[PDB]
Amino acid sequence: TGKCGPPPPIDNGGITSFPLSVYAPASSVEYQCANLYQLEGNKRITCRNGQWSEPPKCLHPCVISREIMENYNIALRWTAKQKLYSRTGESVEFVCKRGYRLSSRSHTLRTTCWDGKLEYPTC
C-alpha cells in the first residue's frame, strides 16, 4: 500500500522515463506529446493510494495542404509555403488566389486550428 503499477498510456504521447513495473506513492512521471500535438493538462502525473492522477491529452494539429487550399481557392497570406502543419491554438490566415473573391459563405480569412479541425474560408 499504496503503490501503483505502470503509468497509463495516452493517445499521441509517451512518458519521458522508462516505465517501472511498480511505483512508490508520491512518485511522478511526465508525458510528452508527439511532434505537432499540444499537450493539454498537467504534464506530470503523480501516484497516490494505488492510483495515478489524471493524465494529459494530446491535441491534434491540422494539416493545411496544397490540395485543400485548391478546393477552397485560397493561399497563405503571410508565407509562400504551399503546405503548413499547425498546432492546436495556432492561427493561420489566407487570401484568395488572383481571380476569386471571398464566397458569401465566408466572412473571415483568419482561422485557428482547434484539435484537428480548422474552418477554411471559401473563395
Binding site: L36, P61, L76, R77, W78, T79, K81, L84, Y85, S86, R87, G89, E90, S91, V92, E93, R110, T112, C113
Partner: protein, 132 residues
C-alpha cells in the same frame, strides 16, 4: 506596388526569458499597416493599424513611445489571439539585450494567468534599416 518588409522577433518565454519566436512581416496597406507573425505553424495577422497612426508608428518603432492598434491579436498564449482586440495601445521601449539593442513591447495578458502579459523585441537595427 506596396512597401513590404519582414523582420525577426522574440518573445520572453514561460520563464520570462527571451527567445527567437520567428518572423514579423510588416506590410503597408491602403489603410495603414498590417503586421503578420510567421512562427512555425502560426502565420496570421499579429496586429494592424490605421493610416492616421502610421507616422506615429514609424517613429515609435524606431525610437520608442506608443501608438494605438486598430486590431491586436498577438501570439498563441495571449488572450487576444483568437478573436482580436481593439484599440490596444502599444508602448515600445528601447532596451539592451545580449550585445544588441531592441525595440520591446508588451503584448496582451495571458490565459489564464493573472498579471502576466507577453513581451516582444525586435532589433532596432532591422527596424531603423527598413523604416529609416
Amino acid at each position: 506596388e506596396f512597401s513590404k518588409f519582414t523582420v525577426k522577433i522574440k518573445n520572453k518565454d514561460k520563464s520570462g526569458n527571451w527567445t527567437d519566436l520567428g518572423d514579423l512581416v510588416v506590410r503597408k496597406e491602403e489603410n495603414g499597416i498590417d503586421t503578420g507573425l510567421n512562427a512555425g505553424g502560426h502565420s496570421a495577422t499579429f496586429f494592424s493599424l490605421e493610416e492616421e497612426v502610421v507616422n506615429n508608428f514609424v517613429k515609435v518603432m524606431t525610437e520608442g513611445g506608443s501608438f494605438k492598434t486598430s486590431l491586436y491579436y498577438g501570439y498563441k498564449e495571449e488572450q487576444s489571439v483568437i478573436n482580436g482586440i481593439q484599440n490596444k495601445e502599444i508602448i515600445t521601449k528601447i532596451e539592451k539585450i545580449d550585445g544588441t539593442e531592441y525595440i520591446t513591447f508588451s503584448g496582451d495578458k495571458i490565459k489564464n494567468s493573472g498579471d502576466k502579459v507577453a513581451e516582444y523585441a525586435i532589433s532596432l537595427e532591422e527596424l531603423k534599416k527598413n523604416l529609416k
